[PDB]
Each structure stands twice: as C-alpha cells, then as structure tokens.
Amino acid sequence: NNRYSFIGGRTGQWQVVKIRNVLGPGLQLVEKVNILNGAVAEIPLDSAWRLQGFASNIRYAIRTELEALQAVEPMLNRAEAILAVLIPIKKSAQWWEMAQDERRDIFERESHHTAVGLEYLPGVARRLLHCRDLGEEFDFLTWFEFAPEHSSAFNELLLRMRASKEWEYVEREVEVWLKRL
Amino acid sequence: NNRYSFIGGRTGQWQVVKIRNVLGPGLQLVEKVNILNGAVAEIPLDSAWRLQGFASNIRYAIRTELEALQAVEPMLNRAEAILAVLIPIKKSAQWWEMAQDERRDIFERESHHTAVGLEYLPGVARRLLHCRDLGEEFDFLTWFEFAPEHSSAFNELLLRMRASKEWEYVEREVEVWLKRL
Ligand code: HEM
Ligand code: HEM
C-alpha cells in the first residue's frame, strides 16, 4: 500500500518536539503523531488533524541523479535516527500550470534541489509523498529523519532551500519536529 | 473535483458499442457506462466494474508542445462528438522504475507520442486520468470522443501508437467503445 496518514493527536510513534508555522495557516500543536500505512476515513479519538499522501514515481530526477542518490542515501528506520521532521508543502497555481520542462528547469537547473540535498546525505534520510491529486490542503508531505548530530545541518538545509527560486512558488509550509518514542 | 468514476453496468449516459480486450485481462461486457465526477465507494448492484482516476498536472509535455496542443485541441462535449472510447492502460514495472529523462525520451524522442497525436486534432477530443497512485488495476484511464467522421482515423491512430516503443511497456489495455445517449 502506497498511502500514508499522519494523525496529529494524543497517540502515535513520535512525540512532537515543536511545530514551526513557517508560511500560511499553521497546524495545531499536539502531543504526538501517529503514522498509518493506509487511508484512514474516520478521525481518531482525541486528534486535531490528519494529513495523507502517497508514494509515487519520479517526476524530475534524471538517471545520473538517481545513481548519485542511490550511492549515498540512507534507509529509513536507522537505529540512530531518533529525530524526524514532517514538512507539508503547498505550491502555487502558477507552478502547477507550468509545463514539465519549465518546472524541471526551476527545480534543478536554477534551484539545484538535488545537488544541494545530496550535500546532507548520508546523514538525512527522506521520503516524499504526494497529495495534491487527493484534494488535500497541501501538495506534498515531506519526511526527514536523522540522528541529533545532524540537526544543525538540517536547519541550514531548510534555509538554503527557502532561498531558492523553487521556493518562490511555495505558498504554505509547516515544520513538525518529532522525536521517536 | 478532479476524480472521475466509470461504472460499467445497466445505466449511464453512454451505451457500450463493443469492448476489445486488447492485451491482458479484459473488462466484462456491459450495456452502458455511467460517468460520475467524484469517487464511488458503493458500486451499483447491476454494475460489473468500476474504474476511477484523477486529472493531474502535466508529466512530459514541454511548453512548445502545450502551445501546439492549445492551438488545435477541441473542447469536450461538442455536439457532434457522439462516439467515445475509454481505454484503460497499465504500464510495466520496468517503465515505472525508469527515471524521468528515460521516460520522456521514450515517450517523445523515440515514440513521438504528442507529434503523432496532434495529427488527429481537431477531430479527436481527449482527457487523461491517472490512477496507478490510487492502487487501481490500471495506471491510466484515457478518454477520446469524436464524430463518426473520424472513427477510421482514430482506428489508425490506435494502430500507430501500438507500434511504438512506448507500447513495448504497455502490459494491459482494453478499448470500451461508446455512443452518447
Ligand atoms: C535531505 C536532502 C534532500 C534530498 C537529497 C532531496 C531530493 C529530492 C529529489 C531527488 C526530489 C525529486 C523527486 C522526483 O523526481 O519526483 C525531491 C522532491 C521534493 N523535495 Fe527534496 N530533497 C532533500 C531535502 C528536502 C527538503 C528539506 C525539503 C523541504 C523543506 C524538500 C522538499 C521536496 C519537495 C516539496 C519535493 C517535490 C517537488 C515537486 O515535485 O514539485 N526536500 N527532493
Ligand atoms: C488523440 C490524440 C492524442 C494526443 C494529442 C495525445 C497527447 C498526449 C499528451 C500530450 C500526453 C502527455 C500529458 C503529460 O505530459 O502529462 C499524453 C499522455 C498519455 N496518452 Fe496520449 N494523446 C493522444 C492519443 C492517445 C491514445 C489514442 C492513447 C491510448 C491508446 C493515449 C494514451 C496516453 C497515455 C497512456 C498517456 C499517459 C502517459 C504516461 O504518463 O506514461 N493517447 N497524451
């Protein structure tokens, strides 16, 4: 099953350390996040929000980029990776109306998204989930996990991505920092 | 709402003219197709199958290709467009594992998918729906509609596409020919 749900509330595998409402409407602070592999039609007991998305095919990365990523990218669920950050992202209408070449040019040629992110591997593991096509309020759910030794580096990455051309099209962003229970 | 369902059964806006089970498991012959904008968790009793997909962003077409398409592509629901064909398609695991550049090169550089398709406009109107990401048995639901005038041309187009490199990755395909009621 390629669908994942993230329920903010009183139960889950992850304790919420903090929520930073970076851009646009925020997410209610809660005690924990519960992650479920599957859709979840009915709101859990004592929960404040649910986010959902699916794992999908590659949309931008070219073969040589995939080869570079595969050589260094870590797996999820490393024993040392006790911190995580869930970052829902929405991009503007102006982005989604662009053609494929226009988007790829902004994403890599101008913003160097993959080349910058590679600078943070193997420390940071990640998962990308898509949800615009489900009708959700965000377009992406992005997930990152790492040992505490990489927290400073991860915060620098965030600032570097926010300085990029690609980020001129980001309309909503929240950071949910988590610690593994 | 970006989701569409196609219910094969005894009711609907479209009468089934024929079903050709081109490759892989077919779809049961039925009297009619009912098309609904929205999902349908409860399939009607006298219906045989339900297909669903969503409209999404562009995956391959470049700006100059979109411009060419926009100059000539017809609207849906033209008065004369009394014939349609619903063609669910599934592509292989080897296709999906390829990177974005590899897929674009097969789609256009080798197969000329858009250049060939443009030869059949304005006669043929179309919609593309995506459903691999919903866990459906097919990956795409493709829809075409046109006057009787263009049936012979549409049949030529089908044969041309099936001769392409891109088609070497198609592993399931069915044609549901319809007439507007
Ligand atoms: C940690 C190192 C990172 C690496 C190696 C990396 C790599 C990538 C790659 C290769 C893609 C494209 C996938 C495809 O072709 O479909 C992608 C997409 C994406 N990434 Fe990153 N990324 C990193 C960090 C980040 C961070 C920190 C953020 C958010 C603050 C983020 C947000 C996104 C988004 C929103 C997308 C989807 C873009 C779109 O489809 O428009 N990434 N990432
Ligand atoms: C009638 C003229 C046609 C035109 C102008 C045309 C045009 C296109 C365009 C431009 C795309 C890419 C959309 C994107 O970038 O996301 C596309 C995708 C697609 N089309 Fe066609 N098409 C035509 C006929 C057909 C026919 C007859 C079939 C099926 C037999 C078909 C099957 C598909 C499929 C399966 C995709 C999805 C490809 C993928 O994402 O891997 N098309 N079409």
Author numbering:
A (entry chain B), B (entry chain A): 2 to 182
From the paper:
Chlorite dismutases (Clds) are heme b-containing oxidoreductases that can decompose chlorite to chloride and molecular oxygen. The two clades exhibit differences in (i) oligomerization, with clade 1 proteins being homopenta- or homohexamers6−10 and clade 2 representatives forming homodimers,11−14 and (ii) subunit structure, with “long” clade 1 Clds being composed of an N-terminal and a C-terminal heme b-carrying ferredoxin-like domain and “short” clade 2 proteins lacking the α-helices of the N-terminal domain.
The latter has been exchanged with either glutamate (Q74E) to arrest R127 in a salt bridge or valine (Q74V) that mirrors the setting in clade 1 Clds. The Q74V variant mirrors the situation in the clade 1 representative NdCld and should exhibit an increased flexibility of R127 compared to that of wild-type CCld, whereas Q74E might arrest the catalytic amino acid by forming a salt bridge. We provide the crystal structures of Q74V and Q74E and demonstrate the impact of the mutations and pH on heme coordination and active site architecture by ultraviolet–visible (UV–vis), electron paramagnetic resonance (EPR), and electronic circular dichroism (ECD) spectroscopy. Besides heme coordination, the mutations are shown to have a strong impact on the thermal stability of the heme cavity but an only weak effect on the chlorite degradation activity. The conformational dynamics of R127 is shown to have a significant role in heme coordination during the alkaline transition and in the thermal stability of the heme cavity, whereas its impact on the catalytic efficiency of chlorite degradation is relatively small.
